[PDB]
Amino acid sequence: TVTITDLARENVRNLTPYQSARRLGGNGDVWLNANEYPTAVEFQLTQQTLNRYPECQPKAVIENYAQYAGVKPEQVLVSRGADEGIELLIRAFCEPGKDAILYCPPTYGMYSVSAETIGVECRTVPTLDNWQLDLQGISDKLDGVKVVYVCSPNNPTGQLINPQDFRTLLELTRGKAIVVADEAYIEFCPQASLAGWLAEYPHLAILRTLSKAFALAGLRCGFTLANEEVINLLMKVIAPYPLSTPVADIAAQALSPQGIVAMRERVAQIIAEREYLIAALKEIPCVEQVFDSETNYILARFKASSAVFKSLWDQGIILRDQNKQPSLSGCLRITVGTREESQRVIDALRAEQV
Amino acid sequence: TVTITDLARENVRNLTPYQSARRLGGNGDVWLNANEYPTAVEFQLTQQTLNRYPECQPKAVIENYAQYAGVKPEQVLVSRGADEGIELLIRAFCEPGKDAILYCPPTYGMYSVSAETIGVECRTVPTLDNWQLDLQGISDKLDGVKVVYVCSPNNPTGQLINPQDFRTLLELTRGKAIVVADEAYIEFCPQASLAGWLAEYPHLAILRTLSKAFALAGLRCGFTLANEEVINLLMKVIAPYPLSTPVADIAAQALSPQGIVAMRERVAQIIAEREYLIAALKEIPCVEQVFDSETNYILARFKASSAVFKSLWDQGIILRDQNKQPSLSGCLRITVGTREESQRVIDALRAEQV
Ligand SMILES: *[C@H](N[C@H](COP(=O)(O)O)Cc1c[nH]cn1)c1c(COP(=O)(O)O)cnc(C)c1O
Ligand SMILES: *[C@H](N[C@H](COP(=O)(O)O)Cc1c[nH]cn1)c1c(COP(=O)(O)O)cnc(C)c1O
């Protein structure tokens, strides 16, 4: 007898689905584990046309985002979060069982998840001690690689990749692979974006999202910025109707001029709050080292991190354990929320210090 | 020099993206080409939690649908339309370059599109003259096939597949392949659903959608019904957050008891209207033959169909040309809308008759 499981693909049977879930409904009061904006921003529907299919790429959304990002509308693609953007790039440039992707741990886990699920080889070149790119290492492992993912600022470490090294990487991949800069957190450091580099690099793609700074993770709305050639190719592999009407509706509102002003105020808010938490964390006894951040989360190495993580978890303070990530032994990622939430963490951590 | 296009996958460069688009904004007044419910049904948001990520599988949505469909919640998966359900099945059971899918033309075009885009072989066994399954033909082409798609009632022909033949097909695939019954239009003939067959067939999956009868195509919300084993396997290949909050929100409302009552009234409405259009169409001179339908669209063979199609198109009456589909030479698919819209088609067609 053959079981349904035997009919499934081998890679599908062996893979471990992404570990994002870690809920405790009604148990945790403070959520600082998903890099979400701490407060809800309300939006109501304005288009009551739900009986009709939406546009494959809602015009209002594409133009409003292109205006905001400073690029041409033909250089923008909108999808179900930056997660889908990650999938699309692999789906269009990587031949299963032949080509490979390359990323540098410790970083965002979906690059690997998508590739492994799709059936594409994952090539890894860990970043250096300061988490900057190991350029020499990358140059020696580009064979068969079609897509390179580099998160900047990086998750979960928080720092920006030296643009000078991005220049090098883009030169190493010229005519060989697509370089994808994941800018899911660029809103917190807009001046460090590579969006203006499109004219110089035909193989440069950029991932963006409304989940983080825009405080609309609930919409599952993201974008890919790239030259026409690339965008047109991705459009050939995307689902016919990737964005729902209600999402296109509120997303377009969120991208209006006033929406951008609000977003920027949310950023200033988070940055100011981050610098507070960072200053306070360095003084706490159980805190060994706090790493610089250009995002809405802070990575810190603790003394007995598993114990600390568990302690705060039992107290309703939900953080994000990084202990199992390469080079991040003893580290926990703390999302920046409100002043009250930061104070909860601070006090709680001071209650440790053993 | 290497171009970006040269970096793309071969199959991606050669494939022709799905042909669903065929708009004429502000030009066409009557849309009977996408099998959408003719009138909008309004829904407002109730959950202002957009700053937080949604559940991977919204509980309210899964339970409300499971209640409606008469199956267990663990036998339900919710995705971005039935289109994604099609993708997921291939993504989980078909090894690119090794396994294949099988469908029977003329039918829904996405089965082939997804497989071709993913990189999986498409095996075809055209249906018989009456569009019923060519069982003997299928039995002889199952080697290497992992997923079989059969739309019932079928699009664009409109008829139901003899359940007796579904029995045969399910026996032929036992322990060899997953049989997927696409029931995107089962709401119009609920008693013909195979949902109650799950306990007998471990390899049976069923595609459902809120786009059609539910009049919520704008939500991009669909479902897959299958035994736990299958659903759990698909959950291993689905994107972490496939459904947005606003969509889960209104979808759950649409599936409430009162929502189901409304849906059923929409169905009765469409069926009554369909039988009118069918009766009237058979009398029109340019109409050669009208085929029986158990859905919200009617297939009919005309005299000089390309000419008729163009004529009505220029008049704001948007139909769906099937002329290039196998065995459907001279056929146009007419979506059932309102009495006024049906009258527009009738009169317009009578204005032809040359
Ligand atoms: C956003 N990821 C979310 C939180 O970060 P982490 O706990 O996984 O390090 C959670 C998530 C979303 N999908 C899977 N996990 C994120 C994205 C995707 O953003 P979208 O909501 O638009 O799909 C892309 N890149 C990065 C670096 C991050 O953090
Ligand atoms: C619904 N398909 C829509 C109209 O039918 P057609 O003109 O393609 O024959 C259009 C569409 C949607 N995606 C691509 N084209 C449909 C589905 C999908 O329904 P969802 O809106 O939930 O993804 C699945 N199966 C069938 C048979 C049909 O018709």
mmCIF file of N, CA, C and O and ligand atoms in Angstrom, chain A residues 18 20 33-35 81-83 108 110 151 155 182 184-185 209 211-212 220 320 333, chain B residues 53 240-241, ligand 1:
data_model
loop_
_atom_site.group_PDB
_atom_site.id
_atom_site.type_symbol
_atom_site.label_atom_id
_atom_site.label_comp_id
_atom_site.label_asym_id
_atom_site.label_seq_id
_atom_site.Cartn_x
_atom_site.Cartn_y
_atom_site.Cartn_z
ATOM 1 N N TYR A 18 8.598 27.235 7.877
ATOM 2 C CA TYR A 18 9.043 28.436 8.580
ATOM 3 C C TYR A 18 8.530 28.554 10.013
ATOM 4 O O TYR A 18 7.360 28.294 10.295
ATOM 5 N N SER A 20 7.623 31.055 12.370
ATOM 6 C CA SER A 20 7.281 32.428 12.684
ATOM 7 C C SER A 20 6.295 32.429 13.826
ATOM 8 O O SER A 20 6.315 33.304 14.692
ATOM 9 N N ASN A 33 7.963 40.795 19.189
ATOM 10 C CA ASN A 33 8.596 39.655 18.532
ATOM 11 C C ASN A 33 8.431 39.531 17.015
ATOM 12 O O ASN A 33 9.034 38.645 16.410
ATOM 13 N N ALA A 34 7.614 40.384 16.400
ATOM 14 C CA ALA A 34 7.380 40.283 14.960
ATOM 15 C C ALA A 34 7.766 41.523 14.162
ATOM 16 O O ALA A 34 7.459 41.619 12.970
ATOM 17 N N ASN A 35 8.436 42.466 14.818
ATOM 18 C CA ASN A 35 8.850 43.707 14.171
ATOM 19 C C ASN A 35 7.668 44.476 13.574
ATOM 20 O O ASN A 35 7.774 45.077 12.503
ATOM 21 N N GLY A 81 3.047 40.857 0.167
ATOM 22 C CA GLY A 81 4.200 41.018 1.035
ATOM 23 C C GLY A 81 5.518 40.810 0.312
ATOM 24 O O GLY A 81 5.544 40.389 -0.843
ATOM 25 N N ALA A 82 6.619 41.124 0.982
ATOM 26 C CA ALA A 82 7.939 40.938 0.391
ATOM 27 C C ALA A 82 8.234 39.440 0.326
ATOM 28 O O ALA A 82 9.153 39.012 -0.368
ATOM 29 N N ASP A 83 7.459 38.645 1.066
ATOM 30 C CA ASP A 83 7.646 37.195 1.046
ATOM 31 C C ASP A 83 7.420 36.673 -0.373
ATOM 32 O O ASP A 83 8.191 35.860 -0.881
ATOM 33 N N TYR A 108 17.347 36.875 7.424
ATOM 34 C CA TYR A 108 15.941 36.503 7.301
ATOM 35 C C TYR A 108 15.779 35.058 6.814
ATOM 36 O O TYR A 108 16.381 34.659 5.815
ATOM 37 N N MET A 110 13.184 33.398 5.356
ATOM 38 C CA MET A 110 12.388 33.002 4.201
ATOM 39 C C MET A 110 13.141 32.755 2.887
ATOM 40 O O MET A 110 12.636 32.033 2.021
ATOM 41 N N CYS A 151 19.983 41.262 3.012
ATOM 42 C CA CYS A 151 19.076 42.111 3.778
ATOM 43 C C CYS A 151 19.850 43.286 4.375
ATOM 44 O O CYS A 151 20.834 43.094 5.100
ATOM 45 N N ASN A 155 18.240 41.718 9.238
ATOM 46 C CA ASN A 155 17.381 41.140 10.258
ATOM 47 C C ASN A 155 18.062 39.791 10.542
ATOM 48 O O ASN A 155 18.346 39.038 9.615
ATOM 49 N N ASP A 182 17.047 43.293 0.278
ATOM 50 C CA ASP A 182 15.801 43.237 1.028
ATOM 51 C C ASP A 182 15.792 44.486 1.903
ATOM 52 O O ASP A 182 16.565 44.590 2.858
ATOM 53 N N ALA A 184 13.183 45.674 3.764
ATOM 54 C CA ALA A 184 11.964 45.627 4.565
ATOM 55 C C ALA A 184 12.002 46.650 5.694
ATOM 56 O O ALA A 184 10.966 47.006 6.254
ATOM 57 N N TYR A 185 13.197 47.123 6.028
ATOM 58 C CA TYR A 185 13.331 48.087 7.106
ATOM 59 C C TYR A 185 14.033 49.369 6.707
ATOM 60 O O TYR A 185 14.502 50.109 7.569
ATOM 61 N N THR A 209 8.144 46.659 1.731
ATOM 62 C CA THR A 209 6.939 46.168 2.398
ATOM 63 C C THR A 209 6.191 47.266 3.156
ATOM 64 O O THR A 209 6.769 48.297 3.505
ATOM 65 N N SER A 211 4.445 46.221 5.808
ATOM 66 C CA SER A 211 4.260 45.543 7.091
ATOM 67 C C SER A 211 4.858 46.219 8.320
ATOM 68 O O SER A 211 4.210 46.309 9.353
ATOM 69 N N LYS A 212 6.109 46.597 8.244
ATOM 70 C CA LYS A 212 6.989 47.303 9.194
ATOM 71 C C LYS A 212 6.640 48.769 9.501
ATOM 72 O O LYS A 212 5.659 49.053 10.189
ATOM 73 N N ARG A 220 -0.696 42.351 4.138
ATOM 74 C CA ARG A 220 0.093 41.412 3.345
ATOM 75 C C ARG A 220 0.374 42.077 2.004
ATOM 76 O O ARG A 220 0.083 41.515 0.951
ATOM 77 N N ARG A 320 11.930 37.641 20.774
ATOM 78 C CA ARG A 320 12.281 36.727 19.697
ATOM 79 C C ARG A 320 13.662 36.131 19.951
ATOM 80 O O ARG A 320 14.669 36.830 19.886
ATOM 81 N N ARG A 333 16.201 39.144 20.099
ATOM 82 C CA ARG A 333 15.816 40.308 19.306
ATOM 83 C C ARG A 333 14.598 40.967 19.945
ATOM 84 O O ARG A 333 13.562 40.327 20.146
ATOM 85 N N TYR B 53 0.368 41.043 12.241
ATOM 86 C CA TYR B 53 0.246 40.009 11.221
ATOM 87 C C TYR B 53 -0.990 39.167 11.522
ATOM 88 O O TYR B 53 -1.371 39.008 12.678
ATOM 89 N N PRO B 240 3.666 31.648 4.585
ATOM 90 C CA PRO B 240 3.329 31.866 5.996
ATOM 91 C C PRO B 240 2.065 32.683 6.297
ATOM 92 O O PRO B 240 1.333 32.360 7.232
ATOM 93 N N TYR B 241 1.802 33.733 5.525
ATOM 94 C CA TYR B 241 0.602 34.539 5.756
ATOM 95 C C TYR B 241 -0.087 34.824 4.425
ATOM 96 O O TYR B 241 0.018 35.924 3.878
HETATM 97 C C1 LIG C 1 8.972 40.533 7.877
HETATM 98 N N1 LIG C 1 8.887 39.379 8.593
HETATM 99 C C2 LIG C 1 8.038 39.300 9.751
HETATM 100 C C3 LIG C 1 8.983 39.522 11.086
HETATM 101 O O1 LIG C 1 10.387 39.278 11.048
HETATM 102 P P1 LIG C 1 11.067 37.802 11.553
HETATM 103 O O2 LIG C 1 10.482 37.455 13.090
HETATM 104 O O3 LIG C 1 10.625 36.585 10.495
HETATM 105 O O4 LIG C 1 12.752 37.953 11.547
HETATM 106 C C4 LIG C 1 7.480 38.049 9.894
HETATM 107 C C5 LIG C 1 7.263 37.144 8.719
HETATM 108 C C6 LIG C 1 6.569 37.406 7.583
HETATM 109 N N2 LIG C 1 6.656 36.274 6.801
HETATM 110 C C7 LIG C 1 7.378 35.360 7.449
HETATM 111 N N3 LIG C 1 7.752 35.866 8.612
HETATM 112 C C8 LIG C 1 10.108 40.575 6.788
HETATM 113 C C9 LIG C 1 9.771 40.404 5.259
HETATM 114 C C10 LIG C 1 8.355 40.176 4.729
HETATM 115 O O5 LIG C 1 7.664 41.160 4.931
HETATM 116 P P2 LIG C 1 6.074 40.973 4.370
HETATM 117 O O6 LIG C 1 5.000 41.040 5.687
HETATM 118 O O7 LIG C 1 5.731 42.239 3.303
HETATM 119 O O8 LIG C 1 5.861 39.478 3.558
HETATM 120 C C11 LIG C 1 10.825 40.461 4.313
HETATM 121 N N4 LIG C 1 12.128 40.659 4.761
HETATM 122 C C12 LIG C 1 12.489 40.811 6.130
HETATM 123 C C13 LIG C 1 13.945 41.016 6.451
HETATM 124 C C14 LIG C 1 11.502 40.775 7.172
HETATM 125 O O9 LIG C 1 11.861 40.926 8.474
#
